[PDB]
Amino acid sequence: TQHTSSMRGVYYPDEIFRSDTLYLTQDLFLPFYS
């Protein structure tokens, strides 16, 4: 059976805490709607 993955596969990339900000990464992650 063949399904799709949406809005899934996100984790905290590092171990520091932010608030009301935006950050971009380049590591291995699960692409949306895969």
């Binding site: 996100v10 932010r18 608030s19 971009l24 949306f32 709607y33």
Partner: protein, 49 residues
């Protein structure tokens, strides 16, 4: 590449991919969730041999 939106008292609340749609690439380049009407330049295209 991803782009993650935190919050106050904040875990991960919303995130949109950076390599899914041209609109997604635009959101990833302007670094905001709301883009007003206009023309924008994002990157460069090239053909891989």
């Amino acid at each position: 590449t991803f782009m993650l939106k935190y919050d106050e008292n904040g875990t991960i609340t919303d995130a949109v991919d950076c390599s899914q749609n041209p609109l997604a690439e635009l959101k990833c380049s302007v670094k905001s969730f709301e883009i007003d009407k206009g023309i924008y330049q994002t990157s460069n295209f090239r053909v891989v041999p």
